[PDB]
Symmetry: D2
Subunit: 121 residues, 4 copies
């Protein structure tokens, strides 16, 4: 037995300008796994939503084909995690997005790369 995992119960869009996104969010009880760290799932889901926001700030609509993430340091209750997203390559129909998460201390929680297929404009 285990309870549901949520993401984006709180958030703030600091910035969403031309394929550059920064969002801040406080870690809450919804975010943690059985060990009381931020759930990998939860952390992915932060990075993924922000990659969708990069796509949108480019004026495009899009879908993620594939993604990779590296977990570096665990997130803890009450961290202000900040989510920094940027298009590192804009092809014709596919886009590569780099998302990084750091905290209030400036340490790095995780990194992820998104390969999107652009579906419309």
């Amino acid at each position: 037995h285990f309870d549901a995992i949520s993401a984006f119960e709180n958030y703030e869009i600091e910035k969403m300008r031309d394929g550059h996104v920064v969002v801040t969010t406080k870690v809450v009880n919804s975010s943690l796994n059985y060990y009381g760290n931020a759930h990998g799932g939860y952390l992915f889901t932060l990075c993924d939503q922000i990659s969708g926001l990069v796509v949108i700030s480019l004026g495009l609509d899009g879908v993620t084909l594939q993604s990779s993430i590296n977990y570096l340091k665990a997130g803890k209750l009450d961290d202000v995690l900040t989510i920094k997203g940027e298009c590192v390559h804009q092809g014709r129909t596919t886009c590569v997005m780099d998302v990084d998460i750091t905290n209030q201390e400036g340490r790095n929680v995780c990194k992820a790369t998104f390969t999107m297929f652009v579906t419309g404009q």
Copy 2:
């Protein structure tokens, strides 16, 4: 503006036997993005939780170092997604887990691979 994404509001553990896991879950409104498909985040988070369940069914405790996922077909409201997890390699301190999601039709929604660092026994 956009609302929170949840995973595992409903679930059923069909099987959790020696590094083999199968969990079923119905897609709900919590699971969908602005286009009404299952959120990549949500889908990752299903695969990731089930990889944590594989680790546990091996008698280990563990942490994910890195993960990759490929999205194949979108999930829709009211799909019974089934999540099939298996340890494809057990090293000394690291484990490789393959997770697949298929639906009620048997089509494939997504695939993911987890590289875990085993933290204890």
Copy 3:
């Protein structure tokens, strides 16, 4: 200083049918790193080429957008490696190819997944 790294000084194509490829090869010296182990780039190239072969067997042309690979066991000088690729998803615009490497002892060397951009017929 280090010596050049090479791939496919020898091979046998056992099968090349409708998205299925089997190809074997004998690890030799230009396959190796400074530890006398089969180079990571070398096993990756074995995998990348057989994914290119899985795609040709399907009357298609394409370029790789993304690949992930996990290293399981070392290749040793003089190993016969069995390289298996199947296209696991055939999309309109993209295909995903699962490639595995086992050795002569059936032990598992290597697994990769390529995300392809289909470009020709």
Copy 4:
């Protein structure tokens, strides 16, 4: 039938200091695929080796557990490729290395991320 694929017939090591590596190289013929483009396995090997160099510059030994790579622009015969690796996370048990490839035109060829298992000092 196809010809053997090769990597590092030539190179210059510009820097090799404290987790930072720069290395250049001239695309030649054994670097290429059947389309006359720099082979995916070839750019991967360039990246994999420079990650191995980033790790040596840090007084460490290690083996790769996982790598992800995105292909951005083709390498063309006769390109001078600039290969940059930095260790972006130094863990107790693992390190993550970001490697990029730009060409002589500053255009971006290639990006990869290696997840390493540290084994020696």
